Structure 1
Amino acid sequence: KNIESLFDYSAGQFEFIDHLLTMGVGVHFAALIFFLVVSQFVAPKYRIATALSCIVMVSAGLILNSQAVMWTDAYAYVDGSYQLQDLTFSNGYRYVNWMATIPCLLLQLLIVLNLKGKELFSTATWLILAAWGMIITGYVGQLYEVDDIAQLMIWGAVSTAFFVVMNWIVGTKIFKNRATMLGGTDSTITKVFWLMMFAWTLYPIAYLVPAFMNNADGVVLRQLLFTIADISSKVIYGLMITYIAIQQSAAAGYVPAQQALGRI
């Protein structure tokens, strides 16, 4: 059981959540068209990093669209407020989606870091195992956000341990392979690390909202934090990854990338 089910919502709270989720869909699908069109300017070595941004945009866009429809299915305006009907709304579906989206985000970073062969395969496997441990333990913890806050906290601590180990793998790989990067992207990639540290830390903050703001305004805050975090961790991040891919492509002599950069 999730905290959303405990409350009735004002028309203001209900409509704001619907608009946040709907705006989220729009931003991700608008970004998808950008990544699709610029993929032709990326060298073959990096083209999979731009394709992964397209995959993340549709995956995230579809979960946000699903959440928006589930939100409107679950509530109806009755006696002056939006009240729970027969259908349920939950954040559980986002956790399931992270099982696919987090590995995609991590893989596109490894590609632009110029990792290849055995090092790429072994780094991706450890990263994906750490990401899955984080997601599964978090998914279990949030099943107790109404019934048992102590259990939410302890599964949250286990999940945070996987998060910290994953961030150490990411940081280690970034600061080690920064020197292999072309066209000044050795500087850009350090900003990508900090963007990840910031954006990804908003998810455990949203996870703890039932512990510090268990009310209808807390429900709104959690959807707002997921909105900021999704746009930063998927869209802004994807735009930086694509910039890095095109810049390294042009530095390596890929003529469509040089022509695209020269045109802007």
Structure 2
Amino acid sequence: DMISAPWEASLTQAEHSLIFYFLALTGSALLFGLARTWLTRGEVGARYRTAVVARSGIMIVATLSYVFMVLAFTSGYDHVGSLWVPNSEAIMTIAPRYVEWSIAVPLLSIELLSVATLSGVSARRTRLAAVAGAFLMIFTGFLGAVVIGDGRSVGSLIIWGAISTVFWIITAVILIRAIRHSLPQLTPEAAALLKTATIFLMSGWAVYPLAYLIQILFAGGLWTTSIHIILCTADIVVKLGFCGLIHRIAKLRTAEDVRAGVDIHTEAIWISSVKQSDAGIPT
């Protein structure tokens, strides 16, 4: 059964204006997130700098992706009558999300594990498996949604969506097992924060398949609009909310190292207005 792809639908003026807003809102929010990451990078010790590196990468690639999509949007539809009619570049308002996710979901996995308590073979095993799984979930998604059948084949979307779902399950299990093993080896305060942060990333992941199901089941300007609103909103919530959460844990673990004498930090660490550690200098 053939369906029409999301980038094939003509848009009303309302829909065209809504999509522009959500794309530009997301790009802007992500650029704020990038700046936040840069400005707060010194709050975290060198032992937990991977958290900052991972988050910087998420914010940079996501920003670039949305900037590309906003420009593609301006060039991918032509006003004809009262409708905006998609040209051959309209696909570049949807496909670049798959590029973003191909990097960002693996980097999220790395960010989450950066503040967990794993080392040795297990650490490397877990990080590789989780990165690989995360990449494959997005890539198989991209094949169904964009490449095989040109986004128009229900069978292709279903098959590749199911494959993507398997990699989702695998990655999730690998990450959840890692966190579960770490929580006993963390301080109560960190353990609690890490558990909460883990629910937010997994739960945030469940929103994205919903846009894929729309592509399978419904076509039209309203549905294209819905896809962009759902994915823009998920991108904002996941890439500001979650990133803030790991930063807090990295700060807390830094401060615990300072108080334990494991390391020193050049500035005081404040979390929710409360001082967690004092500024210090090497002897």
Cα displacement string for residues 120-169 of structure 1 (whole angstroms, at most 9, x for unaligned residues): 22111111221122122111111337532122111111110110111111
Q: 1: CA distance between counterparts of 2:64 and 2:123?
A: 29
User: Which of 58, 63, 66 does residue 64 from structure 1 map onto?
Assistant: 66
TM-score (structure 1 length as normaliser):
0.93
**Counterpart for residue 22 of structure 1:** 24
User: Which of 53, 56, 73 does residue 55 from structure 2 map onto?
Assistant: 53
Are the equivalent residues in 2 in contact too, given 1:249–1:257 (CA < 8 A)?
A: no
Across the aligned residues of Structure 1 and Structure 2, the Cα RMSD in angstroms comes to 2.0
TM-score (structure 2 length as normaliser):
0.87
Cα displacement string for residues 200-245 of structure 1 (whole angstroms, at most 9, x for unaligned residues): 1111111111223211111111111111221222211100000010
User: Which of 181, 192, 195 does residue 197 from structure 2 map onto?
Assistant: 192
5 Å-filtered alignment, 1:1-264, equals 3-90=5-92, 91-143=94-146, 144=149, 146-182=151-187, 184-253=189-258, 254-256=264-266, 258-261=268-271, 262=274
- Report the alpha carbon displacement of residue 181 of structure 1 after superposing the two structures with TM: 2.1
Cα displacement string for residues 15-71 of structure 1 (whole angstroms, at most 9, x for unaligned residues): 111110111111111111111111111111102211221111111011011111111
Q: Bigger CA drift: 71-80 or 180-189? A: 180-189
Cα displacement string for residues 99-120 of structure 1 (whole angstroms, at most 9, x for unaligned residues): 2222211111111003234322
Q: Bigger CA drift: 253-262 or 137-146? A: 253-262
SS of the aligned residue for 1:242 comes to: helix
Percent of aligned positions that are identical: 21
Q: 2: CA distance between counterparts of 1:152 and 1:10?
A: 26
Q: 1: CA distance between counterparts of 2:20 and 2:118?
A: 41
Are the equivalent residues in 1 in contact too, given 2:9–2:224 (CA < 8 A)?
A: no
Q: Bigger CA drift: 132-141 or 78-87? A: 78-87
Are the equivalent residues in 2 in contact too, given 1:247–1:257 (CA < 8 A)?
A: no
Change (3 A) 1:2 1:175: farther
Change (3 A) 1:77 1:240: same
Q: 1: CA distance between counterparts of 2:267 and 2:117?
A: 17
- Report the alpha carbon displacement of residue 3 of structure 1 after superposing the two structures with TM: 1.9
Are the equivalent residues in 2 in contact too, given 1:46–1:112 (CA < 8 A)?
A: yes
The number of residue pairs the alignment matches comes to 264
User: Which has the larger Rg?
Assistant: 2
- Mark the runs of 5 or more structure 2 residues left unpaired by the alignment: 259-263, 277-283
More helix by share: 1
- Mark the runs of 5 or more structure 1 residues left unpaired by the alignment: none
